[PDB]
Design a protein around this ligand. Structure first.
Ligand code: U5P
Ligand code: U5P
Ligand code: G6P
Lengths: 638, 121, 242
């Protein structure tokens, strides 16, 4: 007799009160709506980073009878049982919205039990475990600690059903342990990427999306020296009552590389912060865009022949992965976009930003001189207008006397004196670029300029920002930051000020980048091999999607050159839009923002926690409904 | 030696072969400009709160003519952006203010720069 | 009675014979402006101080990134002028914010004022509805309310025009066209024209309120009007924007 309406929840990951990778943000942003449903039933488990946990965890006492409710008592005794073995652990609240209960196991307080467990693991599943790989060692320690801990809680709680949720191989070890020790807990495993996937796409010569149904998993895994790691990922996948990925595209990849069709998808969601007024995001756009306008002025100083009221900001942003973030396609496509725009005699301009970190020696003197020279113009003009104001005012106040026949001045000469002009003329001369110098394609001195993939590509396709080029290239090899002396915008601000995000990804199990974009109501181009793009693809009919500002490029059933040409079409489709058209598109894009919010994506997590229970206890489940429902999908269950 | 509380900043302005201002020189003025601006936003906010207090006293339980507690005027949001500004001004451990505003074409051979090094200023 | 935390400032703009703005009206305006300029000066000084701290931290014994005591920022010279300006805003004991902005010619027999007097809306502190009669047409040169009428209208929340005789009614029309909700009567030209265009319950959601002056006694009418105004007051910002 165990409760399926009223059940516990344990979510486990390496990256708890501890930022290592993207999973941090996911568990964080997801916390509100989980606590909303679970409150003190919900608990998170992870390791213990001693060097940081202080800034993240509200340290609590788990000993006072006040800490746990009457039905959540077994946990108190279960944690006690673990202290009954000298296992050092911090209990408490995660300093984040929703403030959820965490169990953080200190790892050194089991390090001794290493070899005994390593050996136990080796003969149970067959998982080798080299000593020089500090990470699998930590994954093992953690796995044993956590399964042990769930062994006790299953003993002591007899009311609720227990759900254990694991994220990513690093925190997957416990999963075979739970299946073989036959413990009374339904388990879920989510994979956010596959080991073999990342590695097979690393060199980026391998034709991933076709040849994967044909690779020898053991062979490759051994080729990359990650057989041990791989075994863990595969174990976790196989042991789990429910197996999930973050997206369709990764699901496909999981099936053939981890040898199990995943039961369904858990797309990452966002904690969408709304505004009182719907149109407030339209305002912020124009505000932030003015700051980018400010930068472009200085960047193009003495070579500024276009109209910013007719300019579009394109960006790719993210990790510097030339081939997997599709920076190659971006640049190629832009080169072609320039051709199409010059040819049609269009007067529009595209300024394309590339925001990707690379080893640099900070900003070129250029980039800073220009920004300061425009400032020095701004300040001078402000002086002059003040003098002008005096003169207008005097006219306006003394008319019609002293022979003032007109209400206002009519000769500029009455308002602009020669010393005003001399000054202004001087600021203008400061902004003049040396003969034949075009504005740079990069705002930083680079550690290895000659070998940089991006710069080489920009120079190969010859986008050098000449006056005749209607597409412009600016590479900013550093993450954005309000403290930036030349582009004082944080990233999210910057995104808001842009017109189009362009993320033609090749390998991207989720892609937080276009999602963040969508939420800020910025249109974006994605690919069908991207987790986000693939998720969006199913939610909307293709022609409709463009009107919501989601463009999806086919990188799966098309030659790279066809894939590029599509990218140019979409970009060119977008440039032809009028302001009114873009405004509505953004309004539409902003309207999708809801569907990416946890209030909606959280259901998928629900459906998966359910499928776990209907699988663990189909008898109790059947009767607590009306009949037994289909259980080969999370889809067929609800 | 004399315990003087004063300071002298000595400029030397003499053309030498140079490759223009250093990135440090320009960055430093930009970060100070950014501080100024962030300060100007913050005082506009404070000003709106002083004013509200002033025009409202003694109603709605305002006992003092003026604010008495800074927390009435400076809010969390203001403190964060000012703190970020201060951080941008911070310079790496044990770095000293340069003795030169420019990149020199021949820095090691410069007479002025050799003499300043020699006297350890 | 319902303990509403809201407040309603009702303006009446209808030209009456007058002797221009009361001295009080103009004075109040110059006094506020004067406070604003003083506040501006004080915050400039405050600026220098925050700035100075900020550039100097952590040297010369400045141990926190920012000032923490108000006294570091607000000197006593600043306090004195802010106090001089606050004193100038003071109005003698008992005196209430006026119900009119101009000196009226034959004030005692003005209909508007008389009705206001009669209902006792004298702009008390405990009055949750205030009342201002501006007996001249608005224009941006108005020294106390420098708005043209159309501008003023965009600024408001609700136009209330309970006409008994109105062949058309430009008033609530220019009001609607500028996205400001309006209350009108089924005996108004505009009212009837609109009631005829929407379904009458739906019409409330498009911000056209129509009080029934044909098939209800003046007292049932007045009560309907108050139901309308009350319903609007209950609204939140979001709903007002929508
Ligand atoms: O200047 C930047 C550029 C990107 N990002 C962040 O880096 C991530 C890039 O995603 P990925 O390429 O790591 O998937 C995004 O979540 C985005 O918020 C920044 O914080 N600052
Ligand atoms: O301060 C004002 C107030 C009203 N009106 C005008 O008064 C007319 C109201 O119509 P009626 O019913 O008074 O004729 C409208 O055309 C409106 O523009 C003004 O020009 N300025
Ligand atoms: O930058 P664009 O796509 O041309 O759009 C610019 C427009 O954006 C926002 O909606 C602003 O609220 C409008 O005032 C502005 O005109």
């Amino acid at each position: 007799s165990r409760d399926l309406q009223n059940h516990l929840l344990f979510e486990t990951a390496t990256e708890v009160a501890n930022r290592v990778g993207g999973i941090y943000s996911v568990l964080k942003s997801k916390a509100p709506i989980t606590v909303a449903q679970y409150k003190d039933h919900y608990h998170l488990i992870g390791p213990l980073n001693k060097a940081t946990y202080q800034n993240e965890v509200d340290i609590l006492d788990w000993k006072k009878p006040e800490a746990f409710s009457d039905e959540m008592r077994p946990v108190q005794h279960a944690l006690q049982t673990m202290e009954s073995r000298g296992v050092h652990f911090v209990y408490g609240r995660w300093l984040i919205e929703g403030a959820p209960k965490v169990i953080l196991f200190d790892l050194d307080s089991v390090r001794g039990y290493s070899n005994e467990w390593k050996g136990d693991l080796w003969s149970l599943v067959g998982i080798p475990s080299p000593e020089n790989d500090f990470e699998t060692n930590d994954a093992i320690l953690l796995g044993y600690t956590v399964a042990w801990f769930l062994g006790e809680v299953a003993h002591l709680d007899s009311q609720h059903a227990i759900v254990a949720h694991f994220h990513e191989w690093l925190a997957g070890v416990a999963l075979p342990l739970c299946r073989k020790r036959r413990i009374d807990v339904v388990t879920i495993f989510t994979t956010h990427a596959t080991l073999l996937g990342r590695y097979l796409c690393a060199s980026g010569s391998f034709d991933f999306y076709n040849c994967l149904e044909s690779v020898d998993v053991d062979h490759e895994a051994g080729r990359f020296g990650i057989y041990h790691r791989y075994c863990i990922e595969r174990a976790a996948a196989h042991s789990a009552d429910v197996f999930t990925t973050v997206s369709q595209i990764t699901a496909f990849e999981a099936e053939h590389l981890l040898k199990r069709k995943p039961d369904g998808i858990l797309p990452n969601g966002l904690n969408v912060i709304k505004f009182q007024a719907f149109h407030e995001f339209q305002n912020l756009h124009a505000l932030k865009k003015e700051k980018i306008n400010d930068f472009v002025r200085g960047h193009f100083h003495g070579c500024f022949d276009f109209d910013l009221d007719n300019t579009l900001y394109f960006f790719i942003a993210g990790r510097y992965e030339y081939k997997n973030k599709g920076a190659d396609m971006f640049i190629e496509a832009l080169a072609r976009l320039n051709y199409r725009l010059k040819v049609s005699g269009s007067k529009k301009t595209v300024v394309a930003f590339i925001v990707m970190p690379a080893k640099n020696n900070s900003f070129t003197v250029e980039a800073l001189k220009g920004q300061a020279e425009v400032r020095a113009l701004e300040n001078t003009v402000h002086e002059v207008t003040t003098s002008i104001g005096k003169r207008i005012f005097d006219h306006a106040i003394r008319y019609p006397h002293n022979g003032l026949t007109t209400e206002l001045p009519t000769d500029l000469g009455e308002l602009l004196k020669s010393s005003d002009k001399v000054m202004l003329k001087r600021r203008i001369l400061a902004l003049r670029r040396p003969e034949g110098q075009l504005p740079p394609i990069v705002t930083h001195n680079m550690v290895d300029d000659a070998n940089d993939l991006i710069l080489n590509k920009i120079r190969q396709v010859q986008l050098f920002n000449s006056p005749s080029d209607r597409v412009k290239m600016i590479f900013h090899p550093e993450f954005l930051n309000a403290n930036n002396p030349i582009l004082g915008l944080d990233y999210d601000e910057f995104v808001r000020g842009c017109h189009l995000g362009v993320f033609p990804s090749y390998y991207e199990p989720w892609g937080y980048t276009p999602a963040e974009c969508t939420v800020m109501g910025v249109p974006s181009i994605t690919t069908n091999v991207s987790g986000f793009g693939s998720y969006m693809e199913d939610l909307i009919e293709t022609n409709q999607a463009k009107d919501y500002g989601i463009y999806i490029v086919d990188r799966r059933f098309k030659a790279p050159d066809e894939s590029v040409e599509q990218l140019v079409d979409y970009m060119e489709e977008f440039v032809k839009k009028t302001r009114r058209q873009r405004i509505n598109q953004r309004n539409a894009t902003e309207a999708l923002s809801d569907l990416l919010d946890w209030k909606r994506m959280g259901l998928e997590y629900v459906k998966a926690r359910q499928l776990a229970l209907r699988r663990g206890y189909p008898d109790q489940f059947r009767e607590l409904v009306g009949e037994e429902l289909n259980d080969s999908n999370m889809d067929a269950l609800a």
